[PDB]
Amino acid sequence: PIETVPVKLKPGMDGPKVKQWPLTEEKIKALVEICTEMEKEGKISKIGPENPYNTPVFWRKLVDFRELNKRTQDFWEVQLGIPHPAGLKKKKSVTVLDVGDAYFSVPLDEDFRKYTAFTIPSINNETPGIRYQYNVLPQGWKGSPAIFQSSMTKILEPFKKQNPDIVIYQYMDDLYVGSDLEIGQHRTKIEELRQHLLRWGLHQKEPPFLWMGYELHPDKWTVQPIVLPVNDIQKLVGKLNWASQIYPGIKVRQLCKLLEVIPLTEEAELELAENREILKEPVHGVYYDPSKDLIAEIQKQGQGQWTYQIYQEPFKNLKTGKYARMRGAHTNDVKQLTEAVQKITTESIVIWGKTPKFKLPIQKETWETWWTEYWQATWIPEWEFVNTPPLVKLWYQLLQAIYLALQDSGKSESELVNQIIEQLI
Amino acid sequence: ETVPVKLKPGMDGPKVKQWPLTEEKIKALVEICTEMEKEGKISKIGPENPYNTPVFAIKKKDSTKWRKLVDFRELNKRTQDFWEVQLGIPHPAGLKKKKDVGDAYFSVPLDEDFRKYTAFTIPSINNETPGIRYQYNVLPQGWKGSPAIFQSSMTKILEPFKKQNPDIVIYQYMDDSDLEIGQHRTKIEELRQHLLRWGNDIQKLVGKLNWASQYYDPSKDLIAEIQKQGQGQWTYQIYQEPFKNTNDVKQLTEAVQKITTESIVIWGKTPKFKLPIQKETWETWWTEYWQATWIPEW
Amino acid sequence: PIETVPVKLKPGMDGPKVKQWPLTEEKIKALVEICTEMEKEGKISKIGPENPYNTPVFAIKKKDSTKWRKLVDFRELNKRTQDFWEVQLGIPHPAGLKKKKSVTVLDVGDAYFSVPLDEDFRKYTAFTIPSINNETPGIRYQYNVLPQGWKGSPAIFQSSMTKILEPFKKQNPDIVIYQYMDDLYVGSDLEIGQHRTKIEELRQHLLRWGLTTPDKKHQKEPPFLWMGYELHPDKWTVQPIVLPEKDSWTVNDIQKLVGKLNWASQIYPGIKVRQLCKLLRALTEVIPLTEEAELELAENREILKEPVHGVYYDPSKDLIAEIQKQGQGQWTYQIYQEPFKNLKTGKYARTNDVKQLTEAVQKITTESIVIWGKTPKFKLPIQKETWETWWTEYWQATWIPEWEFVNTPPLVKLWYQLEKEPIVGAETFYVDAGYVTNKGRQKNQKTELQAIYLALQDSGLEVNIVTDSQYALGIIQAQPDKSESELVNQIIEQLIKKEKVYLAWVPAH
Amino acid sequence: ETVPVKLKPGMDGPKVKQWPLTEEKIKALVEICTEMEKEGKISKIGPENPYNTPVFAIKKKDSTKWRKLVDFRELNKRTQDFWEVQLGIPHPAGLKKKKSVTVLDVGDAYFSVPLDEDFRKYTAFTIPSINNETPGIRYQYNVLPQGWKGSPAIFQSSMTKILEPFKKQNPDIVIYQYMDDLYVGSDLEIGQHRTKIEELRQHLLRWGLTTGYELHPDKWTVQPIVLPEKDSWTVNDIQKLVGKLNWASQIYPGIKVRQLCKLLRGTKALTELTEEAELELAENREILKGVYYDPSKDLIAEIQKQGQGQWTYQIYQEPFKNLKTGKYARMTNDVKQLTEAVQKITTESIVIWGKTPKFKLPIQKETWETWWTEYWQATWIPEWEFVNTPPLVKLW
Numbered sequence A: 001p002i003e004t005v006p007v008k009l010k011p012g013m014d015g016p017k018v019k020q021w022p023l024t025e026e027k028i029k030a031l032v033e034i035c036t037e038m039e040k041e042g043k044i045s046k047i048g049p050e051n052p053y054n055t056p057v058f059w060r061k062l063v064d065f066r067e068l069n070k071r072t073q074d075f076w077e078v079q080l081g082i083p084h085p086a087g088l089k090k091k092k093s094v095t096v097l098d099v100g101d102a103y104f105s106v107p108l109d110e111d112f113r114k115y116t117a118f119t120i121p122s123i124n125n126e127t128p129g130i131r132y133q134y135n136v137l138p139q140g141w142k143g144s145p146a147i148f149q150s151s152m153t154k155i156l157e158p159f160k161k162q163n164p165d166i167v168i169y170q171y172m173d174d175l176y177v178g179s180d181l182e183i184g185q186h187r188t189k190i191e192e193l194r195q196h197l198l199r200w201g202l203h204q205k206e207p208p209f210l211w212m213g214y215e216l217h218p219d220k221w222t223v224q225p226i227v228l229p230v231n232d233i234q235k236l237v238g239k240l241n242w243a244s245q246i247y248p249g250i251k252v253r254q255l256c257k258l259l260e261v262i263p264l265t266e267e268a269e270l271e272l273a274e275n276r277e278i279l280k281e282p283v284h285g286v287y288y289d290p291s292k293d294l295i296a297e298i299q300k301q302g303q304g305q306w307t308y309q310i311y312q313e314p315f316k317n318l319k320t321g322k323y324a325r326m327r328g329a330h331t332n333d334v335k336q337l338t339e340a341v342q343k344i345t346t347e348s349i350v351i352w353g354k355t356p357k358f359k360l361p362i363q364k365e366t367w368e369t370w371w372t373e374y375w376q377a378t379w380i381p382e383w384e385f386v387n388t389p390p391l392v393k394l395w396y397q398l399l400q401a402i403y404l405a406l407q408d409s410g411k412s413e414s415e416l417v418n419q420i421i422e423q424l425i
Numbered sequence B: 001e002t003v004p005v006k007l008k009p010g011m012d013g014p015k016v017k018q019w020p021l022t023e024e025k026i027k028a029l030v031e032i033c034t035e036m037e038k039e040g041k042i043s044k045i046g047p048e049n050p051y052n053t054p055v056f057a058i059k060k061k062d063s064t065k066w067r068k069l070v071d072f073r074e075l076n077k078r079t080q081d082f083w084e085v086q087l088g089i090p091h092p093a094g095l096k097k098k099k100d101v102g103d104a105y106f107s108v109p110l111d112e113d114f115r116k117y118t119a120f121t122i123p124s125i126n127n128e129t130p131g132i133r134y135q136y137n138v139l140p141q142g143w144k145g146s147p148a149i150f151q152s153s154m155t156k157i158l159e160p161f162k163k164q165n166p167d168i169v170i171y172q173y174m175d176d177s178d179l180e181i182g183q184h185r186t187k188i189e190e191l192r193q194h195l196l197r198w199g200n201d202i203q204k205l206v207g208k209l210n211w212a213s214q215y216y217d218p219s220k221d222l223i224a225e226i227q228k229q230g231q232g233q234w235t236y237q238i239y240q241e242p243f244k245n246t247n248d249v250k251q252l253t254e255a256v257q258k259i260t261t262e263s264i265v266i267w268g269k270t271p272k273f274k275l276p277i278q279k280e281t282w283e284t285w286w287t288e289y290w291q292a293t294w295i296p297e298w
Numbered sequence C: 001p002i003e004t005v006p007v008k009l010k011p012g013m014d015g016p017k018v019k020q021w022p023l024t025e026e027k028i029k030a031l032v033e034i035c036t037e038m039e040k041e042g043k044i045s046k047i048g049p050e051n052p053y054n055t056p057v058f059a060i061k062k063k064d065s066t067k068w069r070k071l072v073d074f075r076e077l078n079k080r081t082q083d084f085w086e087v088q089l090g091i092p093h094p095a096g097l098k099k100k101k102s103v104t105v106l107d108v109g110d111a112y113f114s115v116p117l118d119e120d121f122r123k124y125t126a127f128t129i130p131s132i133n134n135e136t137p138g139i140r141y142q143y144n145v146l147p148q149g150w151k152g153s154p155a156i157f158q159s160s161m162t163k164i165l166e167p168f169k170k171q172n173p174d175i176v177i178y179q180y181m182d183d184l185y186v187g188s189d190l191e192i193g194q195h196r197t198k199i200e201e202l203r204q205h206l207l208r209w210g211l212t213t214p215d216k217k218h219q220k221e222p223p224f225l226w227m228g229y230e231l232h233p234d235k236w237t238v239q240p241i242v243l244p245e246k247d248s249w250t251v252n253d254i255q256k257l258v259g260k261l262n263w264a265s266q267i268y269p270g271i272k273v274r275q276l277c278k279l280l281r282a283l284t285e286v287i288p289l290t291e292e293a294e295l296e297l298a299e300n301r302e303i304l305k306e307p308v309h310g311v312y313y314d315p316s317k318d319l320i321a322e323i324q325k326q327g328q329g330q331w332t333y334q335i336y337q338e339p340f341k342n343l344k345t346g347k348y349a350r351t352n353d354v355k356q357l358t359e360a361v362q363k364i365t366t367e368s369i370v371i372w373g374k375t376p377k378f379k380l381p382i383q384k385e386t387w388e389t390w391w392t393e394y395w396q397a398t399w400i401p402e403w404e405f406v407n408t409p410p411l412v413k414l415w416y417q418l419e420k421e422p423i424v425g426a427e428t429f430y431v432d433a434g435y436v437t438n439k440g441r442q443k444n445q446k447t448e449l450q451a452i453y454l455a456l457q458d459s460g461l462e463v464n465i466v467t468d469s470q471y472a473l474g475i476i477q478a479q480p481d482k483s484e485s486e487l488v489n490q491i492i493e494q495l496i497k498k499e500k501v502y503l504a505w506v507p508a509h
Numbered sequence D: 001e002t003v004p005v006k007l008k009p010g011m012d013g014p015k016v017k018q019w020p021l022t023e024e025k026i027k028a029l030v031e032i033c034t035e036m037e038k039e040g041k042i043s044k045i046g047p048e049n050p051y052n053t054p055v056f057a058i059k060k061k062d063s064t065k066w067r068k069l070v071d072f073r074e075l076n077k078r079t080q081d082f083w084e085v086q087l088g089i090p091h092p093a094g095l096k097k098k099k100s101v102t103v104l105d106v107g108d109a110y111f112s113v114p115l116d117e118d119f120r121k122y123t124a125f126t127i128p129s130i131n132n133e134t135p136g137i138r139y140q141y142n143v144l145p146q147g148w149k150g151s152p153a154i155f156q157s158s159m160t161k162i163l164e165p166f167k168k169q170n171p172d173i174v175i176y177q178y179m180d181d182l183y184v185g186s187d188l189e190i191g192q193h194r195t196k197i198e199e200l201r202q203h204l205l206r207w208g209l210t211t212g213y214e215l216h217p218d219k220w221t222v223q224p225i226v227l228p229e230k231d232s233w234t235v236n237d238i239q240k241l242v243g244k245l246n247w248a249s250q251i252y253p254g255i256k257v258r259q260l261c262k263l264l265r266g267t268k269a270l271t272e273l274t275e276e277a278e279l280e281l282a283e284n285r286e287i288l289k290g291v292y293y294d295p296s297k298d299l300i301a302e303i304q305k306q307g308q309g310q311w312t313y314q315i316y317q318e319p320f321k322n323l324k325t326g327k328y329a330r331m332t333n334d335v336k337q338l339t340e341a342v343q344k345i346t347t348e349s350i351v352i353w354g355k356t357p358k359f360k361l362p363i364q365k366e367t368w369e370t371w372w373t374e375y376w377q378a379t380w381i382p383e384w385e386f387v388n389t390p391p392l393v394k395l396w
């Protein structure tokens, strides 16, 4: 029995009360049989009719706890995100300890038990409705995931502290454990973990492991099979985003600029075909090696889409990503790169825990010019030069219509000003 | 004894996100946190508490020491009117144009209500583990008004010192003259020992003014802003009402630190201003440069 | 013995040829296993190396699947295939369905594979199962039966099923056999024993032509859940709708919220989505709900709490539609054959109110033609005289079917009746706010409108006002009752309680 | 012996979705189409061929019968341009100067000619079903289409033989064939013309051809429009005059409006003369009371609603240049009045010139699409813009 956390209703609020609607004879019979199974297993309790509180209840039974969720202390939000496959350092062994009814296992304190009520009607109108309460952690309650996560963190403390080498990632219910130990020793450790979590009250799958659009392989992380499909444009942009992590050079600009349902534009077919051509090839990404250093790259797959590639050893990519310069206002190419650079450093600090050494097309003189003439103070941590086909700079070199006469003397849709600039340069 | 200090009526609790930090920083923060837990000053919080305050790490003069400065703006803003009324420390007039504390705060107990509000969280790299979170069971270092609960004990013993020499008066915004600075250094050393006992040109003329363009009352909005018209030009403006008066990021932040101190001296409050550098870009490097508990409004 | 439709490639396009990317052995076991079973069934047959056509296979295992399953991306053959007729995207609306004593649901099994394929296009549907270490060329296969994912496979199956059902439908007139994508929904007015005999007879006929049928016990129970509608015997109800209560709303989440609200608008009256949709004006980005928007969400939830049911169409009576103005720019309509029982309920979302009424009548009659086939006997808020006034004066043709007036608090009316004739015993005013008058008192679209307004209040009850901007003329002549714009609201407000006001345009000279 | 039919080079087939129809229309279409399939003019098709052209059902002659008007305009735009130069159809200028012109329907005779097997697929009609209960029955034309341009082209060789004796017997009668309609024009009196019309009908029935609505040419003259001469001058009237004079300036140059403008003299009471200004008005009155037709360009007929049961039609080849202008006085529902106006405009254009004008109909798209079929009695279907959204009307 995990130590029960104190849960307090929101001050100035009272327990929820909702009416119940009857259902079909087969449905209610199945539901009451399910409840009988729970009671014989002691899973739920039968609250008295004296309790004023109520909550709607609808073989899967769904409880709309939104009324109870209206009155509950805010709980700490579970850390939102996906452990990026690149951040996983290579472990000689891997496991999955999929736990069943993990949310169900957590108990609930006495005060908040009464505020959860369930009214399942009775056939022949013997009772207006059978009244129940959850003695376990309810589904969909605001605090169900956070309380469970904190309880798990407390529950695994004896095992993780003793062993520093073993690394255990926790996500939702499941537990992901990596060991550098041999298969024999690891069998002992996995048995200890299983018996320990069973001691506190809480058929294995086989490699390879695929999850959350992230196919995982010992020396390589590759996305799930990506196939290109208003909602169609939504799906098309969404698929390219998840494919942009490992398939370098994915272009999404034309769709974002594009968005009765209009069809794909004339150039949309060709751009989607280019994306499909890049998608055809199988690409993958290596898990980062702690001993060596992270290196970053920057290149232009297309204007408005600065693509960057974090690589540990050349020609092998740890990850690839896109920065959308076209989204938002058009700026100086060096400024576009600065925006991209900040994007890269945020990703680098969250995923790997360190800043990378950036190899960028912008020349050292050009970056120095950007520093000299700009109003913001944005800075790039590490500057290295790499030759790439697209190399960009600034044009000016640092309603007054006579400016056009001066030029004669020597939106992304408009380029007549660019012709004027070509005459200027 | 313990004096209750509360949030303003109809005010929600303090909740802000922890900007992810580098690994070298998190190592030092976790080691200092576990040390403090061994001392007993900080204790864990369950999932019941909804308050989260940001934790950043700073090192002073390459001393190989990093400190757990906690951005207390939100909770301090929430109880700001409360700490001022219960205890007042107006900034002295002599300090303007004049011709350390907080270590003992660890001994002070804290009331239940504010203790539960001050909750700091250490991050996790790549979401390896749900981040450890704590609560301050002793006096925090960074709450405006945190000195006030323990202010009486220090000033009551600082007064005998001030009895011998009236030249120096000290304001306590957070836990942190006429006498010749060398002689004042001698006096400061003796005071430290005492603490040990305690425990076109015409157009340019018009252009110059255009180039410039581009007493304290508690009810005044005194704003000090640091602007750099490029690396070459730096514009240092302070204002009360509108129209009325090297790493680039490091320069901006250090100048901001200095002007925040200047505003604290003259007006007893940290100025409220917006950074010219992009706030995301600022956040990438804000942690390195500030070296005091004082936190600008941003 | 089903006949094979003549299917050909698009003229001038060679047969597509694709190469399979390597795949891990654990997959290459399940795929070869399922292929061997298919060969036994006759659905797939081996192809010799002479055929030059090959397509890619990507193996996918669904959630809670023990064995990895086969997916063939026939997109290359889809790009190159004779265009086929498109199956009707619309599904039968429950309201149109007449009540019959017994309705039984039959689902044919492996429907695509029961249909045979033309000999010509059997060859093009060929793929190479992946090979490991290049030890063998790899097993290569072609589909005798229709492929799933092909462009025209649903159309060919639809034609096959339609032709198979024609002998049964001709022989039995009472039975109505709706056809969904893969199921036959059968209904008769006969007694349930005779009906059961008829359904088993249909099963035997379909099996004679090679399409499997569900067992008598396995046929679905009387309450049916289909495409978001629960079709109870004497009522149709939209499936239980749950509204998320999350504090921060993703743009995707707001889209889903609007989708669910529109889904439940067909049976739940007065669901307002215009404000939420206005808030929808990065997909992850969150928007703070206006106080108006959260009030709208709250009243929507209040409606959603109670259960509502609609009734199936009965042929004898006559459909009657009543339009009610829920709000400015929003209209709510109910289609009821008998009072207090609604076949369906709809919402029209949007400048004169009677013009919007005309648009709403058009939408209602289009929907009624699609579903029931007869335009309703409309019941509308506006009175007869105002409708006659709008018909004779409007610039564009307007027609409304037979309409009988009903009295509701929010009647549809024109707030001001402008003057096209100059009025005697009145002062004429010229407006640039010029406010020039016959007395001589004196003082870009916004300027032209606001000058007219300032003249209106300055003028008094009766006046003649001239302006050179057709924008102002259009604003006034349109007679907006919505008054969405504050300036426009000012002009409209001043125009209301006046005996006569004449607006005119002077050509520039 | 099927005449070769081919699409215009590089042209795709018809793919147009069928509008939903009232239940009675669908039942009538089902019965008529079943009889036609039994006879053999049409036959069912499967999903192999993805071609569709719309079907509509119209009542005829105010009689208890339902006639089918397949909208073959899209297939016309593709094949008729190819066939008109290939086969051709002359236009007689004498039809517009006859005393009386009648119209007859020669549709039934088109049911005998067979159609090339290659072009059969491009003509397919789908009869829709209510509530999407069943896939719509799809048929195709195995017999010469009725109401498709080029049916007169193919049947012209037979028709010239059919009408040769009647033309040889009577030189005065003048005949033109356009989309199943035969136009008989004569300078004889009404009683004289009707007997010969009966003669031609009997002649058609003698040869096996199976086959009213008299239009009187030379009874139509372009209506001049003159602003009324004011017995007493009125300022509001003067402003209306100057606006209409500018509009007429766009139509006909040379009008001088300044004289009325000077009389306005800035600020005056809206309710309240110079001889020279009067003289200007008289000369402009007579003046108000390009003309040649480019065969390649397509006529556009613009309809303006003056209200109170009156409509005005301007048939013009190019904007601002009007080939004919008239006012349709109307005896109801606005849709029926617009439909009668459209039919009269088209039938008047056909006599004067070959083409049927493209219509700028003043009605919202949904209302026209929903209500046009019931009030329509003419086999030909004009090409129309469903709506001109802005009023686009000067003061009038």
Ligand SMILES: N#Cc1ccc2c(Oc3ccccc3OCCn3ccc(=S)[nH]c3=O)cccc2c1
Pocket (backbone or CB within 6 Å): A083, A088, A089, A090, A091, A092, A093, A094, A095, A096, A167, A168, A169, A176, A177, A178, A179, A207, A208, A209, A210, A211, A216, A217, A218, A287
């Ligand atoms: N489904 C599922 C699933 C399985 C394992 C996961 C995972 O594993 C580790 C867990 C803990 C430490 C290292 C880990 O792995 C790094 C190295 N590594 C990576 C992959 C493989 S297959 N083997 C291997 O050694 C971390 C995060 C999510 C996981 C999800």
Ligand SMILES: N#Cc1ccc2c(Oc3ccccc3OCCn3ccc(=S)[nH]c3=O)cccc2c1
Pocket (backbone or CB within 6 Å): C063
């Ligand atoms: N995001 C998202 C998403 C999810 C499902 C999709 C999909 O499935 C169904 C679509 C319709 C009915 C059943 C389906 O299947 C079970 C539902 N289900 C759920 C999760 C997963 S990962 N897969 C899956 O199939 C078809 C097409 C796109 C889909 C997108």
Ligand SMILES: N#Cc1ccc2c(Oc3ccccc3OCCn3ccc(=S)[nH]c3=O)cccc2c1
Pocket (backbone or CB within 6 Å): C092, C097, C098, C099, C100, C101, C102, C103, C105, C176, C177, C178, C185, C186, C187, C222, C223, C224, C225, C226, C231, C232, C233, C234, C312
């Ligand atoms: N899942 C599923 C499912 C089940 C039936 C459907 C359906 O049924 C009919 C099919 C044919 C005639 C009438 C029908 O139903 C009218 C209304 N109705 C409804 C229920 C009862 S018990 N009786 C009754 O009359 C039509 C369309 C889709 C369907 C989907």
Ligand SMILES: N#Cc1ccc2c(Oc3ccccc3OCCn3ccc(=S)[nH]c3=O)cccc2c1
Pocket (backbone or CB within 6 Å): C256
């Ligand atoms: N196209 C499509 C599509 C999308 C979701 C479907 C669906 O939801 C899931 C139910 C359970 C797990 C995952 C689900 O889907 C992924 C996440 N998710 C959840 C809810 C919604 S509305 N959309 C969504 O993407 C169940 C069955 C069919 C679905 C089809």
